Design a binder for this molecule. Structure first.
Ligand code: LPP
Ligand code: LPP
Ligand code: SKQ
Ligand code: CA
Lengths: 491, 238, 86
């Protein structure tokens, strides 16, 4: 009925609940309330869209409260009692689940993880030792699965070593991919038989699919599809499956060793090759994600990846201009489709012709002129009409001006203005991403690269409650009593 | 070697040609060393130092770009390597008047994907002698996607990075320039070289008294000026 | 064993040492201590990589102290006595 009063009342209540003093006074577990309240406010930020700023700021301050409360720790045992409360590191997993980026990148929390990850130099030593462990990966991976006893099989369970092993396996797969397109390892026979390299590639493809299926049962089509790298893995595995199922059809149906030139389009072998190449592109592109673990290339990559939802909107506005000018330019030239005794027609030939005769060619011509690859004599007809040839050239020129002098520089201005609002919370984001990368290697789930892949609580509540009491007391004394006497003076 | 053979009918890796190649590449560096002369000027010095400080930030970006180059080369060579015609062609490759075999080998593929940052690879190189209008479309789409990723996404992010870095540099810029000019000068204060290349082939305890007196005065002045006379200019609180 | 206490103790000690008053009170040669302390903190900035900002700021303030101490000179002879010492 009265929407105005309802909105004020809801915001006033939520602003009362998200108060550090009220949480520190009457609350059974400050961390749970901070996490849950931050999530609720973040959700409400999108429903009550008239008051986005209020809810976003309240959620931000609920996020900063948990970090400030974790800084009041003065021992490692005292910190492990908090990050392990509930298997191992359950609280940290909950924090990652709730997207508490400030809590995770805390300096003392970020040191316990490093100690759990390295487990035992300068640049040259770290370069030359990581090669020796990655060259001899297959025998470690082979002796782990037979005798997992304390001789050599417990050396592939250390997270750093496991990461090196998986990296070495992936690099071997990439080398085989680069090697598949060589003129020494087959000729062109209709519906061929897999070469010596396809049979080696097949087990990596199977292992990758098995790791993906394992990781996708656990998540359950929620927050698994959010991660964009997992989306790319899904797409490239789909393409590999489609490649397997076309190399067989062209085996049982077609055969005869016909010459390659005199084949016919949509022959299954050609489409198999096309899908295989497009899959190679994605497979090789996945090598960027390796460098979120480096300290120099990590932050830069995260910053690059955050400026992509701002370029897609701009490209969507550009496609409308492209379509408008294509619609205009095809209406003028479609009466002149000569194609008179031409071996090749289109713009992808040495003498370009029929650049605006159909809608598809028109879109292609207007796209390849962003890079200057469409000559200027394509705006001529075989007749002598020096008025349509002028209207067409003016349409082409106006498109060039709008596309290469107006829209491109606005894209540059947008990107410059966005990059400054990103490069402040940049290290928090990078450490949160690196922490997720590390946590994926702390468990004995995969522990094995794809090629070789086919009371107990009530007592602890006492210590945890004692720790919370001390933490809350320290926070109250330090933040809301000792930093209130440093404000300014007024009238 | 000797005998005065005509130049055209020599054979590759003949030592004279490699000597000439190394000599030219050395001339490039020798002439390039003339930039360092202008750290002594007052106008071109700071600008040169600022340019030289924005180079460790471009190398990281180029390293990220090489991965994209290699990925798309791996993709584009897999598609076109069955069509290495080279049928009665005097010259083959992309450095000829009629470009051909642009994606037939990995090396040519890297070269083709590099020279298209500057627009020097024509568009008819994505055709085969057959009539397969489906591989010729997948190849053109791969080439177009590489162009979009390389010339509309990565270049403008390089520009944004450089703009954001240059502001954090141009504050401590004169300090850096004067430190560099001071090193340049100090290299000429001693009688070690003193001669250009063409024509080139107690004593202390007494002084500790004065030094200690000077330090005592300096420390006294600093204490009086900084930690006693600039503490009475802070603000008021509750 | 207890890495958290070890880190706090080391940072607290180094932050005490890089103090203009403590240097100007008990130190045989302020310039040597400023130079050496700045170098040590700059080095530690890369080992204890979890606390880079602290050590970088401490080294920066040790660098600014020596400059501020050299501004309290009022003669050329007095300046040459400092820049020529060995
Ligand atoms: C240095 C920056 C470069 C920018 C260049 C801009 C030049 C502007 C025009 C200069 C005049 C020369 C023309 C003379 C030649 C001739 O007569 O001929 C016309 C030629 C076309 O070639 P022809 O000579 O064959 O006709 O050039 C033109 O067509 C001029 C088109 C100019 C269009 C300007 C559009 C302004 C943008 C408005 C913003 C749009 C908002 C976005 C909408 C979604
Ligand atoms: C003014 C700014 C200019 C920017 C231009 C962007 C245009 C986008 C597409 C417009 C649609 C026209 C296509 C129609 C022609 C056709 O069908 O044909 C397809 C043609 C290829 O030429 P062909 O016509 O011969 O096929 O063009 C294309 O291939 C379109 C490729 C678009 C790829 C977009 C990729 C988005 C970038 C994502 C970020 C990547 C992150 C980095 C990873 C490390
Ligand atoms: O986690 C994955 C998933 N991978 C898949 C999955 N499905 N289809 C594919 O083509 C590929 Cl490459 C392999 C790459 N990595 C990392 C392994 C350690 C080094 C950095 C990359
Ligand atoms: Ca995955």
């Amino acid at each position: 009925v009265d929407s105005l009063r309802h909105s004020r009342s809801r915001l006033n209540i939520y602003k009362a609940l998200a108060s550090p003093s009220l949480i520190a006074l009457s609350s059974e577990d400050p961390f749970l309330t901070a996490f849950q309240l931050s999530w609720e406010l973040q959700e409400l930020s999108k429903v009550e869209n008239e008051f986005k700023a209020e809810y976003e700021e309240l959620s931000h301050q609920c996020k900063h409260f948990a970090k400030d409360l974790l800084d009041q720790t003065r021992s490692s045992r005292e910190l492990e009692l908090i990050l392990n409360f509930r298997n191992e590191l359950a609280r940290l997993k909950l924090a990652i689940k709730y997207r508490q980026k400030e809590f995770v990148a805390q300096p003392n929390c970020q040191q316990l993880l490093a100690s759990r990850w390295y487990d035992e130099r300068h640049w040259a030593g770290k370069l030359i030792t990581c090669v020796f462990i990655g060259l001899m990966f297959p025998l470690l991976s082979l002796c782990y699965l037979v005798a997992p006893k304390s001789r050599y099989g417990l050396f592939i369970r250390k997270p750093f070593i496991k990461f090196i092993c998986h990296t070495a396996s992936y690099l071997t797969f990439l080398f085989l991919l680069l090697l598949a397109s060589q003129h020494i390892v087959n000729p062109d026979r209709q519906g061929p038989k897999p070469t010596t390299v396809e049979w080696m590639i097949l087990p990596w493809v199977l292992g990758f699919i098995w790791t993906e299926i394992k990781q996708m049962w656990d998540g359950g089509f929620q927050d698994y599809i959010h991660d964009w790298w997992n989306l790319m893995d899904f797409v490239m595995n789909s393409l590999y499956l489609a490649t397997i199922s076309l190399k067989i059809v062209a085996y049982v149906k077609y055969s005869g060793c016909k010459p390659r030139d005199t084949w016919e389009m949509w022959h299954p072998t050609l489409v198999a090759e096309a899908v295989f190449a497009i899959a190679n592109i994605f497979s090789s592109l996945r090598l960027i994600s390796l460098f979120t673990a480096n300290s120099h290339l990590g932050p830069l990559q995260i910053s690059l990846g955050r400026m992509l939802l701002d370029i897609l909107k701009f490209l969507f506005i550009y496609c409308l201009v492209l379509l408008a000018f294509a619609n205009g330019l095809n209406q003028l030239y479609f009466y002149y489709e000569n194609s008179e005794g031409m071996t090749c027609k289109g713009i992808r030939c040495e003498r370009q012709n029929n650049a605006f005769s159909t809608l598809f060619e028109t879109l292609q011509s207007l796209f390849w002129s962003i890079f200057g690859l469409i000559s200027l004599y394509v705006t001529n007809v075989k007749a002598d009409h020096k008025f349509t040839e002028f209207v067409g050239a003016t349409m082409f020129g106006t498109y060039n001006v709008i596309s290469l002098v107006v829209l491109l520089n606005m894209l540059i201005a947008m990107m410059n203005n966005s990059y400054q609002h990103i490069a402040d919370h940049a290290d928090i984001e990078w450490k949160f991403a690196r922490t997720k990368l590390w946590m994926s290697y702390f468990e004995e789930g995969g522990t094995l690269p794809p090629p070789f892949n086919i009371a107990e609580n009530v007592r602890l509540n006492h210590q945890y409650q004692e720790v919370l009491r001390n933490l809350v007391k320290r926070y109250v004394a330090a933040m809301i009593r000792d930093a209130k006497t440093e404000e300014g003076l007024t009238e």
